[PDB]
Design a protein around this ligand. Structure first.
Ligand SMILES: Nc1nc2c(ncn2[C@@H]2O[C@H](COP(=O)(O)OP(=O)(O)O)[C@@H](O)[C@H]2O)c(=O)[nH]1
Ligand SMILES: [Mg+2]
Lengths: 165, 158
């Protein structure tokens, strides 16, 4: 089976670990450890084709990780997750994209903007702003909610499809 | 009352408060308490590099082969983080050197993938399967080949 390497990047607390655990084990975990950075492997069927997704659930970005460097150097796709109830994550998405483009040295990398925590009543990040930024960068935008699993599979499959094309 | 004391012990083990861990253990806290994913206080102490809390928990009677929701033992986390003293102490207390998680990854796999050569050689010295295949048919040598770690490949071969 073809192996696609994905990196779940973003700010701390946005929900990268929750999204990845929701995808691989179909349940929601709260108060997950914010410093453990583990790579998971998930066998999926997309458009009828079977693939293996190796997802780096990024964490501990303050320190240096050789595995994180290797993943970002050879990253086939990125989930630039941000929390809609947190403006700072939406601001740091640009810095993360700049770092990814610098390390990859490529003007076109498969990235997907993800707005987590859609279930929360607060909407401090407007959907219009995220849609406009995604359109400007020409990349899909999916709103997910690891607490209710609304769109986790859709977001990951969209990222895989972006990898394919 | 049980749950709150358990959570306080877990947060003290994670944060690295020897005085708080001692007070909570003397207060009746459960050493086998697990959070939502399953991290016991020994999981968090091995993960965060707190040698003293690891010693206190192992003396008090903390389970050393407990696994979280993904089947990772405290030895798994101590290997993935690169805490040589902690892995040596856990293996001294007879921690499973060939434990398998939900992907069937030996702590050797995590130590090799993260790039910690000293953890890899310590685990090999203490009886770790060099030719161990996970649930996706990969070994430590396969990890070294994929990551291009020449020193890790040399250590595994010899
Ligand atoms: N409602 C809701 N809460 C979330 C979601 N994702 C994460 N959380 C909460 O955020 C807290 C920590 O987020 P976490 O996943 O550890 O952040 P990360 O490790 O930086 O990706 C957890 O206690 C979750 O309850 C989501 O999609 N919806
Ligand atoms: Mg995380």
């Amino acid at each position: 089976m073809t192996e696609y390497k994905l990196v779940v990047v973003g700010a701390c607390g946005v929900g990268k670990s929750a999204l990845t655990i929701q995808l691989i084990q179909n349940h929601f975990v709260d108060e997950y450890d914010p410093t453990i950075e583990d790579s998971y492997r998930k066998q999926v069927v997309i458009d009828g084709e079977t693939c293996l997704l190796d997802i780096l659930d990024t964490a501990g970005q303050e320190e240096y990780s050789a595995m994180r460097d290797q993943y970002m150097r050879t990253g086939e796709g990125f989930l630039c997750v941000f929390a809609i109830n947190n403006t700072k994550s939406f601001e740091d998405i640009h810095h993360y994209r700049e770092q990814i483009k610098r390390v990859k040295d490529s003007e076109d990398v498969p990235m997907v903007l993800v707005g987590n925590k859609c279930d929360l009543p607060s909407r401090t990040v407007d959907t219009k702003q995220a849609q406009d930024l995604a359109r400007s960068y020409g990349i899909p935008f999916i709103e997910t909610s690891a607490k209710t699993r609304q769109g986790v599979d859709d977001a990951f499959y969209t990222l895989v499809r972006e990898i394919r094309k | 009352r049980k749950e709150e004391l358990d959570k306080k012990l877990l947060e003290a083990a994670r944060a690295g408060q020897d005085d708080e861990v001692a007070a909570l253990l003397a207060k009746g806290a459960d050493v086998n308490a697990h959070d939502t994913f399953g991290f016991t206080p020994l999981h968090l102490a091995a993960l965060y590099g707190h040698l003293e809390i690891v010693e206190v928990l192992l003396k008090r009677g903390a389970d050393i082969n407990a696994d979280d929701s993904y089947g990772r033992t405290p030895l798994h986390l101590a290997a993935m983080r690169g805490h040589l003293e902690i892995v040596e102490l856990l293996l001294r207390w007879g921690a499973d050197v060939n434990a398998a998680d939900e992907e069937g990854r030996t702590p050797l796999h995590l130590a090799a993938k993260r790039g910690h050569l000293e953890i890899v050689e310590v685990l090999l010295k203490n009886g770790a399967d060099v030719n161990a295949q996970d649930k996706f048919g990969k070994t430590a040598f396969d990890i070294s080949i994929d990551n291009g770690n020449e020193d890790l490949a040399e250590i595994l071969q010899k």
